[PDB]
Amino acid sequence: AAKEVKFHDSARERLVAGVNLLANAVKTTLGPKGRNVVIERSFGAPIVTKDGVTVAKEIELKDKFENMGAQMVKEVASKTADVAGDGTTTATVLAQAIVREGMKYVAAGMNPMDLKRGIDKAVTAIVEELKAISKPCSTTKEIAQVGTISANADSSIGEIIAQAMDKVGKEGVITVEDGKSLENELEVVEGMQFDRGYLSPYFINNPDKQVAVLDNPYILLHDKKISNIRDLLPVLEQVAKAGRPLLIIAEDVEGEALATLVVNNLRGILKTCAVKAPGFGDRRKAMLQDIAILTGGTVISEEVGLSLEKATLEDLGQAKRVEVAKEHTTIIDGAGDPAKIQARVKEIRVQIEEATSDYDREKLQERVAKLAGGVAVIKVGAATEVEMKEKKARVEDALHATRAAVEEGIVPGGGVALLRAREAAVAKGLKGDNPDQEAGIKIVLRAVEQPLREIVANAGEEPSVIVAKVLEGKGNYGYNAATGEFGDMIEMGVLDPTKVTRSALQNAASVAGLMLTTECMIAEAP
Amino acid sequence: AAKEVKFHDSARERLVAGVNLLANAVKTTLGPKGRNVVIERSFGAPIVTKDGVTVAKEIELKDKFENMGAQMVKEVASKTADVAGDGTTTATVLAQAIVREGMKYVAAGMNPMDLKRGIDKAVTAIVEELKAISKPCSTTKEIAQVGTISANADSSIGEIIAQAMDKVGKEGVITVEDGKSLENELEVVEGMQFDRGYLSPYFINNPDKQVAVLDNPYILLHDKKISNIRDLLPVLEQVAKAGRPLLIIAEDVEGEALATLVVNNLRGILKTCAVKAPGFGDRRKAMLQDIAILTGGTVISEEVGLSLEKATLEDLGQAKRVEVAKEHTTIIDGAGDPAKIQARVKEIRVQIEEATSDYDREKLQERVAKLAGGVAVIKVGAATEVEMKEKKARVEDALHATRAAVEEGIVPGGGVALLRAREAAVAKGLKGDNPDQEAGIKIVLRAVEQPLREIVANAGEEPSVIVAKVLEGKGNYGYNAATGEFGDMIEMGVLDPTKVTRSALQNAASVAGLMLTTECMIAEAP
Amino acid sequence: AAKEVKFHDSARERLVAGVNLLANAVKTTLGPKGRNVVIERSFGAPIVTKDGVTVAKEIELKDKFENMGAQMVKEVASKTADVAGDGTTTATVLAQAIVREGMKYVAAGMNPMDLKRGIDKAVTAIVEELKAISKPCSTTKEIAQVGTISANADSSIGEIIAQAMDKVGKEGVITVEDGKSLENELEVVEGMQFDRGYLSPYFINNPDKQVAVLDNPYILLHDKKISNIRDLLPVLEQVAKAGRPLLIIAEDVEGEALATLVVNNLRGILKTCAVKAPGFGDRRKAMLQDIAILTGGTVISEEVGLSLEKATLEDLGQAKRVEVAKEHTTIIDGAGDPAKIQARVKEIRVQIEEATSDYDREKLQERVAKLAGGVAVIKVGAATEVEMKEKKARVEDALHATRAAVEEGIVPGGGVALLRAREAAVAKGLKGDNPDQEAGIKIVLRAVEQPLREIVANAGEEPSVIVAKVLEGKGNYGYNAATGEFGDMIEMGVLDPTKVTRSALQNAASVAGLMLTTECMIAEAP
């Protein structure tokens, strides 16, 4: 169709309008005293929320050229969120601040590329300083404290998180399942997680968690491509007559087969989910074999003398539960006997010494870890189903925060962390090779205080005086919007994982650079 | 339907508006510091790009008369790109410069035909000078250096390209396939490439590469026309039950057969691709026989006593992979045994002495080279699939640049090459037989500096002073927009193949002549 | 009041519209077969004219910015006309041609200052060539022939002009007065002409001749400024009671005195005219004394002991007639006795040897010439007053043409002269130091053929073929629009004085340069 093209300021200002309109809605839900945002529902009463994730997801504008910036900032915010579990509100606010300051200098005739380079230099310096301000958290007591703080002073959640992490590994897999009692419980079951997601968003069945969950399904293993629906019809018919859900692991599924699976999932004909097999090259067969032996199934392949047209339910693997997310899929309580699993673990461990390179050895070690480590399952316990729903979400959020916290430590939250990092970086000595790079540095130095300013503004106080008072303090000293007091932010349990702040700042800087160095904009004509 | 006609300046100005609207968007992505361009996607986040190929492809103006110039300049830019692998950004910029200067003289009452002739004379002189400025590259060390420079200082890519080119031939066929390890690997397999493309764009399956790729397909050989779908239904049914893809080589396919194949490819019913058989006349049968013996198949023909209605899978040839591009199709690892292939090579080599003419002998030599040379396959190796995707594209771009570079040598890139050629041609003595031809010469002399001017402008510096300083230097001395320094452009590894610049200049001159000597403009009425 | 400012092309195009619309009206009255132009009169029937002078004078446009160019071109045309007696139609046409061609190059980005310099170079070369093409006319037979040709084959007019010029001097003063018989007569009377005109256009009384004529007036001589009306009221009242007209010669008149004189002339109270005294410095007193002794009056001055408050009619000079033009004033038949005039002539001639410098000697010689030469009066004779009016105008036009012709010779008229000069200059070798200067040369080379093209177009023939045929001929060969034949233009009596063509070309070049190098334009706001 016909396109409409906008150049220079006439397009940068539309980007700015879009990002400003997205951020003005998102930032009202930032801080302990964040305001409410009312969102229309198609039917029934409007939904009111005070979290940035839901408000941002619903925001998309009428004008296409503003929607461009809105969606790019939303995408970078979601990229920040999915890897840290929080900060998408912070990332959008930081991006708005950086862009709003950057357009002032761009309109001043200053070089956009040098502005981008100065912004990158300042962000690199601030991130490098965050690695020093951050307090590490590796002791079980520290892990429990961080979990309790993230779970709103619920000590049981923190204790359960610590007990799951300290025996399965800080890099281990932890999942949450509804418990059978009032007290939370945990267990280790045979399972693994691999970095493969569902191939279509229609596969999801839990919009609240944005994941696909199947209960006691069959596992289909294939090492070749699947495009023809006929190639798996006799197997899916057996699965449907069996009545249990289906998880299909293949090299790829596309075309009429994928379309038919999507239609079946939408119509409720059969509960199906298809993901790409993990790894590539020769690692593909090893991954498929390990998954099959873990789920008790057999890989369907010509080299092993089986065909999908004749495959039966006996060849298929099975497990208690499989969770399919956007980036990774995990298997819970595979049907494989522990004896064969341990034998294969020993086989892989002795093949480790057969590695021809450090890359081979590290992949074999990853295989050993993903196979022998199992999956930690947290049985969240509470009195009622209504309390079940809330406690499960709280435990999941605490688990994500602890996973982020244990990797990079904790840092004074509420936006004080960025101020401390900025002051430390400036004291270290930060300069640009050009006056344009100097303005780029100034842009980030002014923008990194925006999260605290907006938290204070939503709290109702005057931003400038609070920011000045926070800057006059040193260390963990900061402002607590929940109570309005000044003191050690860590001591009151107001924390953010260093990963969250670092990722928010870096993604905001990236999107700000992209929409500062943008000179042309192409969109569909009205 | 209703037509609308525009004459003289009232049409030339619409052509100029179209080409200007295309080039203003394209040129922002020119140079090492090219800006970003945001392009709308039907769903999801907008795509941001800084390459001219993608930005140009998306441009479709609203007004038909402007879209005429936009699409014609886009077509000539694509013709530049597909034969050199780069320069479509340069070609559009040069065409915009030439047309914008030419309209000034056309409005001045000066003769358009003499302007076109002067432009052609100046372009011929500049191209002739480029053949002297260009540094040849034929040594293996030179080939590796050019490959490394084109692949962003990746010495392994350059070494692999050199090792593929030096043993298969500078005119040989080289393809890229995903490797099985971290280190890149190369091999020679039996195969052939012929100048025949897919007969419909719907046959493609890799929009990123704009080619059709089929894995382990069947090869169908026919020497007659195919229009009736019934003529090949029993064969396509056998292929579909076999499940492997189909490649059909015939004199031509059209009508209901082609429509059914397109519908099957779109629906995913069967993976099919149809191309015209290479050659014509008596060469057609020789081409088909060589392809059949290379793929292990048999040609279906009445003169050999076979009919397509009774053809079976045994008659069909097969190979590991076939790649179908717009202009050429290649076959990788044909099923033909090496003994019969070598015997046919000797047969063709002894038939070479039987040639009745030099044209016959050169065609027989082409047969020998294309058959015995095989196909070089580069196994691009890297750690991950994400790194696989980037490294494969980088290797393909380096291969295209090296293929262009080895044919015509390398020349100082960044637009300095055109300035050096212009200065050398002017010093040689360039004149027009008319004042209008003199203005035509001046048009090209001013326009050939536009690429450097826009590279500098995107870099942020002032174009005029940089161009003057470059002109004050001699030889490879020029401006490097990546670092802002002045020096030998070849020594900093900023290069363009002579083919790229020559083709860009010539195609820009051709399209500029067409849009300067245009007096009538016929388009559909609103 | 508020001003409106237009810059660059937005102002140059308004100038061009104004000059184009002025010239499109003026040029229709060019050539022997010039068309008619009908002009509205305030009351009565519209006046129809086929002369450029009247059509141009009535032209002034509604839009101020177009009127700027219209009036500037009109002013330069009038400057051409008043010094040569003809060519204001040619000058406007040449200016239109030069400006219309120069706009094409200015819009082409070509340098306006270099265009102006090239135009000046070409005009200088063409004018230098005109000095060689021009046939001189100094013999009495040649003067009579030129006068007869200018007077539409009236041999009596030419004979009278020759007899007036050959005995009073080719630089002498010749005037036309109504005769007392059918046959024309001439005589020499005591008088002089000085280069001072009327100080206000209200002083004129002959709109047909655009001059002020007074019959048997009084001459007032004063060497000081006059501003107070009281300073001359006692003399003005005496003159009014006397009833004869008044001519006032003073250093300057301004303020209430000038206003009262203007009001009296408009009301018919008294016939008055005031001009500045000729010369300056010590020459002023000599001029006043010579004028007084020629008119029989006495100079009113403090150094001589007379004041204007007590001056009487006896002190005032008198003469038969005084004619006051825009630039010069002449006195006919002064009351001074010839004996005193001859004595003063001898006095000035012996003071010539007393000159301290060549400048003093040449001014003394000018005094001798202007005093002793007298004034030639042509008594135009005809049967009726209606024929009187036409014959007087014809004799005046012939006299002006002869005066212009005798100074610089005659040249083939009808626009052939400019073509011959252009061809001779091009053959001599004419070039510009820049391509912009070359375009400036081409502008004039194309424009100098415009007068012939327009003469032919008004004649009805095709301009291009006639121009080509004229160019194919050499010498005086050209096209005669009166009869449509080709031959020696001089032999058919179609002539233009070299002064007319030279002045027209130079003034057109000047105004074209001014309107080409114009970048800003200021006019009153609506």
DSSP code of A36?
P
**Looking up tokens 């260390």, which residue turns up?**
A475
Measured distance CA(B472)–CA(A231) in Å, rounded: 70
Q: What tokens does C335 get?
A: 């009351």
8 Å CB contact between A452 and A31: no
8 Å CB contact between A502 and A404: no
Q: What tokens does A147 get?
A: 């979990």
Question: Resolution (in Å) of the shown entry?
Answer: 3.3
Main-chain phi, psi angles of C222, to 5 degrees? -140, 145
Q: What tokens does C232 get?
A: 């001359």
Amino acid, single-letter form, for residue A24: N
Q: Is B13 on the interface with C (CB under 8 A)?
A: no
Between helix B435-447 and helix B88-107 the angle, nearest 10°, is: 150
Pairing of strands A518-524, B36-39: parallel
B226 three-class SS? strand
Q: Is C97 on the interface with B (CB under 8 A)?
A: no
Other C-beta atoms closer than 10 Å to the C-beta of B437 total 23
- Would you list which residues of A are annotated within the binding site for ATP? 29-32, 50, 86-90, 414, 480-482, 496
Chain breaks in chain B following residues, C–N > 2.5 Å: none
- Would you list which residues of A are annotated within the binding site? 29-32, 50, 86-90, 414, 480-482, 496
Contact residues for B478 (Cβ-Cβ < 8 A; gap 6+) = B412, B414, B415, B416, B419, B452, B470, B486, B487, B488, B489, B494
DSSP code of B229?
G
Q: What tokens does B107 get?
A: 């409005």
What is the Cα B176 distance to its own chain's centre? 16
Q: Could you tell me which chain B residue has the CA closest to the CA of A71?
A: B45
Measured distance CA(B205)–CA(B264) in Å, rounded: 13
Q: Is C206 annotated as a binding residue?
A: no
B13 chain-C contacts, CB cut-off 8 A: none
- CB contact under 8 Å between B39 and A254, yes or no, is no
Q: Could you tell me which chain B residue has the CA closest to the CA of A7?
A: B25
**Of B223, B458, B222, B245, which Cα lies nearest the Cα of B331?**
B245
Cα dihedral across residues C383, C387, C389, C393: positive or negative: negative
Q: Could you tell me which chain A residue has the CA closest to the CA of B32?
A: A113
8 Å CB contact between C34 and C55: no
B89 chain-A contacts, CB cut-off 8 A: none
Q: What tokens does B270 get?
A: 């069967």
Q: Is B107 on the interface with C (CB under 8 A)?
A: yes
DSSP code of A86?
S
Measured distance CA(B383)–CA(B389) in Å, rounded: 11
Measured distance CA(C53)–CA(C82) in Å, rounded: 11
Measured distance CA(A137)–CA(A405) in Å, rounded: 7
Amino acid, single-letter form, for residue A87: G
8 Å CB contact between A136 and A404: no
Measured distance CA(C121)–CA(C127) in Å, rounded: 10
Q: What tokens does C424 get?
A: 């001779």
Main-chain phi, psi angles of C321, to 5 degrees? -155, 145
Q: What tokens does A307 get?
A: 């065909």
- Mutate which: B22, B40, B42, B71, vs A, most A CBs within 10 A: B40
Q: Where would I find the H helices in B205-277?
A: 233-242, 256-267
Measured distance CA(B105)–CA(C77) in Å, rounded: 31
Amino acid, single-letter form, for residue B152: N
Q: Is C442 on the interface with B (CB under 8 A)?
A: yes
User: Could you tell me if residue C143 is left (phi over 0), alpha (psi between -120 and 50 degrees) or otherwise beta?
Assistant: alpha
Element (H, E) at B376: strand B375-380
**Looking up tokens 């037509």, which residue turns up?**
B3
Contact call for A and C: 3+ CB–CB distances under 8 Å: no
Measured distance CA(B294)–CA(B282) in Å, rounded: 19
Q: Is C107 on the interface with B (CB under 8 A)?
A: yes
Contact residues for B7 (Cβ-Cβ < 8 A; gap 6+) = B519, B520, B521
8 Å CB contact between A405 and A208: no
DSSP code of C198?
B
Measured distance CA(B313)–CA(C384) in Å, rounded: 122
- Which technique was used to obtain these atomic coordinates? cryo-EM
Q: Is B89 annotated as a binding residue?
A: yes
Main-chain phi, psi angles of B38, to 5 degrees? -100, 125
Q: What tokens does C159 get?
A: 């004979």
Nearest-neighbour CA in chain B from A59: distance (Å):
13
Counting DSSP H helices and E strands in chain B, the numbers are 18, 20
Measured distance CA(B242)–CA(B233) in Å, rounded: 14
Q: What is the DSSP code string of A135-202?
A: BP--SHHHHHHHHHHHTTS-HHHHHHHHHHHHHH-TTS-EEEEE-SSSS-EEEEESEEEES--BSSGG
Q: Is B53 on the interface with A (CB under 8 A)?
A: no
Contact residues for B27 (Cβ-Cβ < 8 A; gap 6+) = B52, B89, B92, B93, B96, B454, B458
Measured distance CA(A56)–CA(A75) in Å, rounded: 10
Contact call for B and A: 3+ CB–CB distances under 8 Å: yes
CA angle C344, C317, C306 (to 5 degrees): 90
Rounded to the nearest 5 percent, the helix, strand and coil shares of chain B are: 50, 20, 30
- CB contact under 8 Å between C107 and B109, yes or no, is no
Amino acid, single-letter form, for residue A173: V
Q: Is B478 annotated as a binding residue?
A: no
CA angle A287, A291, A294 (to 5 degrees): 140
Q: What tokens does A469 get?
A: 């008072």
- Would you list which residues of A are annotated within the binding site for ADP? 31, 50, 87-90, 414, 480-482, 496
C17 three-class SS? helix
Element (H, E) at A452: helix A450-459
Measured distance CA(A117)–CA(A110) in Å, rounded: 13
- CB contact under 8 Å between B108 and C107, yes or no, is yes
**Of B124, B125, B108, B128, which Cα lies nearest the Cα of B435?**
B108
Element (H, E) at B269: none
The count of residues in chain C is 526
Which residue of B35, B59, B388 is in closest CB contact with A519?
A: B35
Measured distance CA(B132)–CA(A396) in Å, rounded: 69
What is the Cα A206 distance to its own chain's centre? 16
| DSSP E strand boundaries for A31-139 | 37-39, 47-49
A517 chain-B contacts, CB cut-off 8 A: 35-36
Measured distance CA(C105)–CA(C115) in Å, rounded: 8
- Using H for helix, E for strand and C for coil, what is the string for B170-208? CCCCEEEEECCCCCCEEEEECEEEECCCECCHHHCCECC
Measured distance CA(C269)–CA(B415) in Å, rounded: 84
Residue C221's Cβ-side half-sphere holds a number of Cα atoms within 13 Å equal to 27
- CB contact under 8 Å between B108 and C108, yes or no, is yes
- CB contact under 8 Å between B55 and A227, yes or no, is no
B68-87 burial code (b ≥16 CB/10 A, e <16): bbbbbbbebbbbbbeebbbb
- CA distance readout (Å), C141 to B140, C132, C174, C406, C490: 96, 21, 18, 12, 15
Element (H, E) at C45: none
- CA distance readout (Å), C51 to B84, C18, C39: 69, 20, 12
Q: Is C50 annotated as a binding residue?
A: yes
8 Å CB contact between C28 and C34: yes
C252 beta partners: C225
Residue B235's Cβ-side half-sphere holds a number of Cα atoms within 13 Å equal to 28
User: Could you tell me if residue A4 is left (phi over 0), alpha (psi between -120 and 50 degrees) or otherwise beta?
Assistant: beta
B5 three-class SS? strand
Q: Is C394 on the interface with B (CB under 8 A)?
A: no
What is the Cα C327 distance to its own chain's centre? 9
Measured distance CA(A277)–CA(A221) in Å, rounded: 8
- CA distance readout (Å), B7 to B181, B517, B523: 62, 12, 12
C22-61 burial code (b ≥16 CB/10 A, e <16): bbebbbbbbbebbeebeeeeeeeeeeebbebbebbeebeb
Measured distance CA(A88)–CA(A102) in Å, rounded: 21
Which residue of B107, B435, B438 is in closest CB contact with C108?
A: B107
Measured distance CA(A300)–CA(A304) in Å, rounded: 7
Rounded to the nearest 5 percent, the helix, strand and coil shares of chain A are: 55, 20, 30
8 Å CB contact between B419 and B470: yes
Q: Could you tell me which chain A residue has the CA closest to the CA of B266?
A: A255
- Mutate which: B21, B38, B392, vs A, most A CBs within 10 A: B38
Q: Is B481 annotated as a binding residue?
A: yes
Measured distance CA(B436)–CA(B442) in Å, rounded: 10
Between helix C88-107 and helix C450-459 the angle, nearest 10°, is: 120
Q: Where would I find the H helices in C151-220?
A: 155-168
Contact residues for B285 (Cβ-Cβ < 8 A; gap 6+) = B223, B299, B301
Q: Could you tell me which chain C residue has the CA closest to the CA of B108?
A: C104
A412 beta partners: A495
Q: Could you tell me which chain B residue has the CA closest to the CA of A515?
A: B36
Q: What is the DSSP code string of B283-340?
A: HHHHHHHHHHHHHT---B-TTTT--TTS--TTTSEEEEEEEE-SS-EEEEEESS-HHH
Q: What tokens does A319 get?
A: 């497990």
What is the Cα B360 distance to its own chain's centre? 28
8 Å CB contact between C200 and C262: yes
Measured distance CA(C321)–CA(C164) in Å, rounded: 19
Q: Is C298 annotated as a binding residue?
A: no
Q: Is B90 annotated as a binding residue?
A: yes
Measured distance CA(C403)–CA(A8) in Å, rounded: 68
8 Å CB contact between A121 and A437: yes
Q: Is A339 on the interface with B (CB under 8 A)?
A: no
Contact call for C and B: 3+ CB–CB distances under 8 Å: yes
Counting DSSP H helices and E strands in chain C, the numbers are 18, 20
Which chains have 3+ CB pairs within 8 A of B? A, C
CA angle C227, C229, C232 (to 5 degrees): 100
Other C-beta atoms closer than 10 Å to the C-beta of B217 total 25
Nearest-neighbour CA in chain B from C187: distance (Å):
59
Residue A525's Cβ-side half-sphere holds a number of Cα atoms within 13 Å equal to 11
**Of A126, A2, A10, A138, which Cα lies nearest the Cα of A65?**
A10
8 Å CB contact between A186 and A379: yes
Measured distance CA(C242)–CA(C237) in Å, rounded: 8
Size of interface B-C (CB pairs under 8 A): 16
Measured distance CA(A150)–CA(A393) in Å, rounded: 12
B239 beta partners: none
- Using H for helix, E for strand and C for coil, what is the string for C441-485? HHHHHHHCCHHHHHHHHHHCCCHHHHHHHHHHCCCCEEEECCCCE
Element (H, E) at C523: strand C520-524
Measured distance CA(A434)–CA(A440) in Å, rounded: 9
- Mutate which: B105, B115, B430, B446, vs C, most C CBs within 10 A: B105
Q: Is B269 on the interface with A (CB under 8 A)?
A: yes
Pairing of strands A477-480, A410-412: unpaired
B213 chain-A contacts, CB cut-off 8 A: none
**Of A205, A200, A174, which Cα lies nearest the Cα of A188?**
A174
Q: Is B61 on the interface with A (CB under 8 A)?
A: yes
Measured distance CA(A452)–CA(A97) in Å, rounded: 12
Which residue of B24, B240, B268 is in closest CB contact with A255?
A: B268
Measured distance CA(A231)–CA(C191) in Å, rounded: 127
Amino acid, single-letter form, for residue B426: V
CA angle B126, B55, B66 (to 5 degrees): 80
- CA distance readout (Å), C476 to C412, C454, C479, C492: 6, 19, 10, 10
Measured distance CA(A170)–CA(A380) in Å, rounded: 20
Pairing of strands B3-7, B520-524: antiparallel
Amino acid, single-letter form, for residue A305: G
User: Could you tell me if residue A364 is left (phi over 0), alpha (psi between -120 and 50 degrees) or otherwise beta?
Assistant: alpha
- CB contact under 8 Å between B108 and C104, yes or no, is yes
Nearest-neighbour CA in chain A from B47: distance (Å):
9
Q: Is A352 on the interface with B (CB under 8 A)?
A: no
- CB contact under 8 Å between C105 and B108, yes or no, is yes
Amino acid, single-letter form, for residue C159: E
Q: Could you tell me which chain A residue has the CA closest to the CA of B462?
A: A111
Measured distance CA(B361)–CA(B341) in Å, rounded: 20
- Mutate which: A117, A307, A520, vs B, most B CBs within 10 A: A520
Max alpha carbon distance in chain C (Å)? 75
Contact residues for A510 (Cβ-Cβ < 8 A; gap 6+) = A76
Measured distance CA(B99)–CA(A158) in Å, rounded: 71
**Looking up tokens 């049409």, which residue turns up?**
B11
Other C-beta atoms closer than 10 Å to the C-beta of A156 total 18
Nearest-neighbour CA in chain C from B213: distance (Å):
52
